[PDB]
Amino acid sequence: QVTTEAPAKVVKHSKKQDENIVVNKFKPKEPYVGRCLLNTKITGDDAPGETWHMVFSTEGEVPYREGQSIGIVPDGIDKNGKPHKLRLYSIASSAIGDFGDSKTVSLCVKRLVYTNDAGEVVKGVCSNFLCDLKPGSEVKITGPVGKEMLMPKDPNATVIMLGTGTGIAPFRSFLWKMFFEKHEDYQFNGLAWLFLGVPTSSSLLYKEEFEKMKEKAPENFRLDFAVSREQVNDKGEKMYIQTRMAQYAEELWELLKKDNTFVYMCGLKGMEKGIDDIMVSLAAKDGIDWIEYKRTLKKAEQWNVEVS
Numbered sequence: 001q002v003t004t005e006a007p008a009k010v011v012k013h014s015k016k017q018d019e020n021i022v023v024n025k026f027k028p029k030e031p032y033v034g035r036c037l038l039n040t041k042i043t044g045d046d047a048p049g050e051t052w053h054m055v056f057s058t059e060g061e062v063p064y065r066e067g068q069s070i071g072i073v074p075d076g077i078d079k080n081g082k083p084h085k086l087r088l089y090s091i092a093s094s095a096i097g098d099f100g101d102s103k104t105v106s107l108c109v110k111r112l113v114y115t116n117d118a119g120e121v122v123k124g125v126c127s128n129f130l131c132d133l134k135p136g137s138e139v140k141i142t143g144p145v146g147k148e149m150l151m152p153k154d155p156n157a158t159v160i161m162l163g164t165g166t167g168i169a170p171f172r173s174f175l176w177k178m179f180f181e182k183h184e185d186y187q188f189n190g191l192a193w194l195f196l197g198v199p200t201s202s203s204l205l206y207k208e209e210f211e212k213m214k215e216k217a218p219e220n221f222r223l224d225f226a227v228s229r230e231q232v233n234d235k236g237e238k239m240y241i242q243t244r245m246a247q248y249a250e251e252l253w254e255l256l257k258k259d260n261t262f263v264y265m266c267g268l269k270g271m272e273k274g275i276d277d278i279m280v281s282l283a284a285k286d287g288i289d290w291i292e293y294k295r296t297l298k299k300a301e302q303w304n305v306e307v308s
């Protein structure tokens with residue numbers, strides 16, 4: 001008698017792709033050092049700000065999956081001569097990545113530039129270090145991190161993705177695995193619906209890639225853009241993400257009542273409110289309380305949010 005089945009730790013059940021998940025392999029103390037392969041500005045010279053797409057080599061050392069983030073420790077020192085603390089960035093590439101070899105990672109970064117009360121033009125430290133990165137230079141990477149935005153296991157589920165600005169990042173990740181990759185254990189056949197809010201047309205992130213996916217899966221891939229400073233509803237209200245969602249109110253509420261519908265939200269902290277406003281009315285007309293229903297969805301792993 002050399003064996004025994006040690007009693008099992010009690011565990012919560014999950015509908016998301018978390019099997020063999022990895023978080024925090026690399027710490028800021030000793031980050032994984034990768035190199036920049038490419039770094040391109042994806043917004044028009046005319047857009048209010050600049051957003052860049054960049055790819056780093058990982059030689060397969062960073063075991064990330066769709067929906068996770070990695071931290072970046074930007075080169076340099078702060079005002080007190082100390083190294084910079086990490087900044088987190090949602091991964092914009094699928095687990096196998098932009099080279100299809102599982103040896104790279106991609107980011108979608110907005111260059112942060114503003115002016116303080118003193119009237120001084122301030123440049124965000126990490127975002128400017130990243131957007132300035134030249135191919136061939138090293139970059140310190142930490143993580144992976146996160147389990148909230150992991151894709152659902154069900155390959156026939158309805159996945160509603162709501163994002164603003166660079167919040168599109170994890171959705172580009174999900175969608176690559178869903179429509180640009182042939183997976184033995186996962187071949188998506190449900191309905192993927194993406195809503196993306198950006199300020200101008202010169203700011204439409206990954207527009208061409210999304211259009212190729214629609215041209216390849218015209219049935220099960222739906223795409224709706226909400227250009228806030230160019231588009232307007234019938235009353236002249238700015239077309240924010242919730243204003244566009246409102247044109248499909250009947251349909252979305254109908255999908256939300258389905259049990260295989262998963263909603264993901266990523267981007268600005270504020271997008272959260274206008275959407276709940278839209279949802280509270282729908283449930284109300286249906287004799288439902290969104291406050292209680294949302295609670296249920298959240299616990300059922302069907303209302304996933306990652307905003308900052």
Ligand SMILES: Cc1cc2nc3c(=O)[nH]c(=O)nc-3n(C[C@H](O)[C@H](O)[C@H](O)COP(=O)(O)OP(=O)(O)OC[C@H]3O[C@@H](n4cnc5c(N)ncnc54)[C@H](O)[C@@H]3O)c2cc1C
Pocket residue numbers: 069087088089090091108109110111112114115116123124125126127128166167169308
């Ligand atoms: C999980 C997670 C994922 C993220 N994913 C992404 C992503 O994919 N892409 C992305 O670009 N960002 C993402 N971010 C944000 C990112 O981590 C950084 O905060 C961002 O890049 C800015 O950092 P920085 O080092 O450039 O700026 P910092 O040097 O840290 O400066 C930021 C500070 O400047 C001030 N500030 C910022 N904006 C303004 C303003 N408009 N007016 C006045 N003061 C201001 C604030 O005090 C703020 O604390 C994510 C954040 C989290 C938590």
Ligand SMILES: NC(=O)c1ccc[n+]([C@@H]2O[C@H](COP(=O)([O-])OP(=O)(O)OC[C@H]3O[C@@H](n4cnc5c(N)ncnc54)[C@H](OP(=O)(O)O)[C@@H]3O)[C@@H](O)[C@H]2O)c1
Pocket residue numbers: 089090110164165166167168169197198199200227228229240241242266267268269270271272274306307308
């Ligand atoms: N995992 C994460 O937590 C994660 C991942 C990626 C990005 N982010 C965060 O999300 C943000 C992305 O910012 P960005 O600079 O890329 O975006 P932005 O370009 O400044 O604007 C995004 C769009 O959303 C609109 N908007 C503003 N307030 C809104 C509101 N309350 N409800 C709905 N829409 C609203 C804006 O309209 P107007 O400009 O006309 O006002 C704009 O069209 C960053 O702050 C980043 O930190 C977080």
